[PDB]
Design a protein around this nucleic acid. Structure first.
Ligand SMILES: Cc1cn([C@H]2C[C@H](O)[C@@H](COP(=O)(O)OP(=O)(O)OP(=O)(O)O)O2)c(=O)[nH]c1=O
Lengths: 249, 430, 248, 253
DNA sequence: TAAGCAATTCGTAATCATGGTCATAGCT
DNA sequence: AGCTATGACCATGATTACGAATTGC
């Protein structure tokens, strides 16, 4: 009998506004320590991994491990009905095919029910390794950058060095070069550079990554060589939302 | 007879007869006034076609004589006076000329023909030998023209419009070969082909038919005229192309098969003169490219000057399946073997199209295009298991009873699109 | 020479933007009682009843009793040309087929001379019933409840008991079962006689709730098997009532 | 070489926003006096003219009077990648195929260098010489955008008449002639609609273009219109004392 | 119990890029 | 609460993809 009371409703609205454009279905693992999500999209280019652990929920309880497949556009149509303040009470029984959302306004107690499905997402992820360049930057600027090179081309060149990091794109209308130079309290640019690494990615996934922008204001880009780019947002006191993307050539 | 195969060709017979009646209902609703503007337009375009009917070249087609059987016969000296059959008890590739008259043909099962001849042998082929005996012949063919165009492993369009003029000032031992010197071949256009056939004969210990024509489609049928170990020739003059274009069935031309035969038995066509006598009928009835093909096969027109890969598939048939795990596991072997064969040419495909066949014989080609270029045995299988998933679970209480699965990498990229090769994520995951 | 001068010019704007979606042409009955309209939609289910009294028109003058047919799309596209702080002067004559409008601004007047038409009028009366339940709820909360319920299905089952008013629906995913309990111009008041459970269709209530910016609060008026009233009261001008019929 | 730094980095995000659906290729005569542009549009009736002179720039150097053939749609797709309060520097070599844009934020940590591939065309420098007018009308900008977006729901032609006491924007249609009447202002911020005149004006214009011409409305807060007989309407915008942007459109029949 | 590859043809239909509209919110 | 920004939702050709059918070797 999974049961989860979240006193800040806009966290769940923001998460499933982030994940509905890139992937379109998910298979949530809900176990005794939090909610986990592991999903690669259709083209098998990106991966999205998500953990919200069982401590920033204002109440959480679960008695047996559940696997819950969810159409994310159906859940993003149901969760469009809460306001920005509804205490959201997701309940779900174990062997029933419906997830009962119960909103609660701060007595307008809605009660929505959704159908699940049988989805078998792949039960594998990137093993734990070490990374070479770890930039940490303001996430409004990262979203502005990933939405400011798609007007040029569909290839971004992230060239990372010690003084800063440079984003360049070259397409049929020309080319462009944005250079980040390191800092002098959350406009802070910290570059844990080791080896200067130059890579190239697809912007049609970097624009879908930047739809978790109001989930934080600090984003960590973690790169290496022959290894996917990591973009990470931290949902405050809750957990994280990571995006892995594969490079070109 | 009354087989499942008979049932599906019965349904296909119903469908082609339904299209026969759907054509005859559109055939009656034209008049003698609807045979005017279309006829004038297609014969104005035929005036634009036939005025520049350029045939200064001499295109040679060179078939073989029961190729898959003959290359076995150059490597089996025991039974040269016997009828041989390649394939097995499901399908025949091609059988030899000591069995063609008896009925043992191509596209015929291993049980239909074998009940006709109780004294026969049916031996599965060796597909590695023919790829070498093709190249041995291609060594001889490259000398007379460097730009020869081998369609299959045996057919070979050659252009000898330039080699013949540069042969006139030759001595009588450059134009003379030895039996494996032997008889000197002359400088005529028949003689260059006699030389080619003699070299392919006493350099592969075999025989080879031939055919000389001013065009390609004429060569394809002249190669069938005097067929076993023989040849033929047409002269390049616009009268002499007409005397052979008559009195020909359309069971002979390539591009007019079996169903476009029966859809022309309706309108009273056997010879190509009758096929010419229905300009405004066939121009209004059939589709655009098909009436193009009919109007250019009528006057005998086509390729006057001769000219990479676009697909790569693996299909596989088997007995009746009714389980759920066996389809998912057997798609992986077909993903793997195709991933082996995809890297030998080093090609990056970006489409997987699975293709399933019921036990009562319906095709189901389910396609899926990705943006990651696909090469390896695990970057395919995660594009085809999500199509086996969509078409196993759409029969919600019932299994799939298949007999053939097959994968097909397609859409191989250019030089403009191989410098931006996006990669899959399944190379990196674990 | 009919003249009707209204000083809060946003009233007619919110009304006609709530009417131009549903019905196409309609009849304006112009009398000493004020401005009247009863019309049906183009699918003959909903019944629009607009009543404007003469007390709060800042100057009224209506000698004869006129009837003016208007196409509401053209009238509303003229009623997207004035600010929310203007003085409307509606005008008509018997010597012309032109409904004149003048928008006065506190130095940009806006003259319009719209065409009328001539429709074949239908004066259908509403027999007044004694309603089983009349609820009063703030207008925005009802607009939110219908507009968020429209994504779930189309069959809204409005239920009512003295403790609570209970909207249900259904659809291809599951029933969005909204409640509202018994509870300061933003309260919910339930006048109940017998408990009600009655079906309606949301795809016209969505056309109804675009009169939300008229009043702060709406009143629903219901009886068993009688078509319901959804009433949006302009303060001290009249009301705008919508009638919908239950299904099955 | 040519390099030009400009501190108001929003003006090129608005000058090159009022000119992306109207025209699609133009001739930036980059010379010692400053950036110009002249372009009749894709229908060859409306004459855009634009001038950013030298003294309003932060810094500015060039001596080779060059003439860059600039594609305005792609250039606006690049200038829509800058912040509002940035600082914009233009860079060009002499025989250059490309042109470099520098977006420096005042936060100074992020700097942007875009590079745009040019083309080459020749445009008509159809010179507009010194004229004298009849009526001038100096008015708010949101008001003019509101007036034209009102009258474009009624009809699709506009009679504009100017007399001593003000202006009439009269727009007939299929559903009844709209009419909006504006008067002057005596002793009052932006509300002043100052209308001066030597002889009255009744001209007539179309409304497919006055929903394009007042796309320049965030560039200023007062537009001016000028009119006379047998001379086109002059729709003038001023920029932050760097120069101006004129649109020209002719009367009808 | 009736293959195994490849190539091509047309008509269906899925996805995408496009501008327009609407709602909610930061700024006035 | 209006102005403007701007992101969600939606119409919609349109290129691109899908699929059965047909032809060859
Ligand atoms: C027609 C056909 C040929 N083949 C193979 C077998 C043949 O040895 C080879 C050549 O095709 P063909 O050259 O047309 O046939 P053939 O040479 O065997 O007989 P002929 O000389 O009378 O034309 O290709 C098939 O596998 N399947 C088929 O349907």
């Amino acid at each position: 009998m999974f049961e989860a009371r979240l006193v800040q409703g806009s966290i769940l609205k923001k998460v499933l506004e982030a994940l509905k454009d890139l992937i379109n279905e998910a298979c949530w693992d809900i176990s005794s320590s939090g909610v986990n999500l592991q999903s690669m999209d259709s083209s098998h280019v990106s991966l999205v991994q998500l953990t919200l652990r069982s401590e920033g929920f204002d109440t959480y309880r679960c008695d047996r491990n559940l696997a819950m497949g969810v159409n994310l556009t159906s859940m993003s149509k149901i969760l469009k009905c809460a306001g920005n303040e509804d205490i959201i009470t997701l309940r779900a029984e174990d062997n029933a095919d419906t997830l009962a959302l119960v909103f609660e306004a701060p007595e307008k107690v809605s009660d929505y029910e959704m159908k699940l499905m049988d989805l078998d997402v792949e039960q594998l992820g990137i093993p734990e390794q070490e990374y070479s360049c770890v930039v940490k930057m303001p996430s409004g600027e990262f979203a502005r950058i990933c939405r400011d090179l798609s007007h040029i081309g569909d290839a971004v060149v992230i060239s990372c060095a010690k003084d800063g990091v440079k984003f360049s794109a070259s397409g049929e209308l020309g080319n462009g070069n944005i250079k980040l130079s390191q800092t002098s309290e959350e406009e802070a640019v910290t570059i844990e550079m080791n080896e200067p690494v130059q890579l190239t990615f697809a912007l049609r996934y970097l624009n879908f990554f930047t739809k978790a922008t109001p989930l934080s204001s600090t984003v960590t880009l973690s790169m290496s060589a022959d290894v996917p780019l990591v973009v990470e947002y931290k949902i405050a006191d809750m957990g994280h939302l990571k995006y892995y993307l594969a490079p070109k050539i | 007879k009354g087989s499942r195969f008979y049932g599906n060709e019965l349904k296909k017979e119903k469908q082609v007869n339904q299209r026969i009646e759907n054509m005859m209902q559109q055939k009656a609703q034209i008049t003698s006034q609807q045979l005017r503007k279309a006829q004038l337009q297609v014969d104005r375009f035929a005036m634009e076609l036939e005025q520049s009917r350029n045939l200064s070249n001499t295109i040679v087609h060179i078939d073989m004589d029961a190729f898959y059987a003959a290359v076995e016969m150059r490597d089996n000296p025991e039974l040269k006076d016997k009828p041989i059959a390649v394939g097995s008890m499901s399908m025949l590739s091609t059988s030899n000329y000591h069995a063609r008259r008896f009925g043992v043909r191509a596209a015929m099962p291993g049980f239909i023909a074998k009940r006709l001849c109780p004294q026969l042998i049916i031996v599965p082929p060796n597909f590695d030998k023919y790829r070498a005996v093709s190249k041995e012949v291609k060594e001889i063919l490259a000398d007379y023209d460097p730009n020869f165009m081998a369609m299959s492993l045996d057919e070979a369009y050659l252009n000898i419009t330039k080699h013949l003029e540069e042969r006139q000032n030759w001595p009588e031992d450059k134009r003379r070969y030895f039996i494996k010197n032997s008889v000197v071949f002359g400088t005529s256009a028949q003689e260059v082909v006699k030389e080619i056939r003699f070299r392919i004969e006493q350099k592969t210990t075999l025989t080879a038919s031939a055919g000389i024509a001013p065009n390609t489609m004429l060569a394809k049928v002249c190669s069938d005229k005097n067929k076993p170990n023989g040849q033929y020739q047409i002269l390049p003059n616009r009268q002499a192309v007409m005397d052979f274009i008559k009195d020909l069935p359309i069971r002979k031309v390539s591009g007019i098969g079996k169903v476009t035969e029966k859809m022309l038995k309706a309108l009273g066509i056997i010879t190509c003169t009758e096929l010419y006598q229905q300009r405004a009928l066939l121009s209004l009835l059939f589709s655009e490219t098909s009436w193009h093909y009919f109007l250019h096969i009528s006057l005998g027109l086509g390729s006057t000057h001769l000219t990479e890969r676009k697909s790569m598939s693996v299909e596989r048939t088997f007995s009746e399946i009714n389980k759920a795990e066996e389809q998912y596991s057997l798609c992986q072997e077909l993903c793997s073997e195709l991933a082996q064969d995809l890297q030998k040419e080093r090609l990056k495909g970006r489409t997987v199209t699975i293709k399933l066949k019921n036990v009562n014989f319906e095709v189901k080609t389910r396609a899926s295009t990705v943006s990651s270029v696909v090469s390896t045995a695990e970057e395919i299988f995660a594009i085809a298991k999500e199509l086996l998933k969509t078409e196993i679970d759409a029969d919600f209480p019932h299994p799939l009873r298949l007999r053939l699965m097959g994968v097909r990498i397609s859409s191989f990229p250019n030089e403009e699109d191989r410098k931006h090769q996006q990669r899959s994520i399944i190379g990196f995951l674990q």
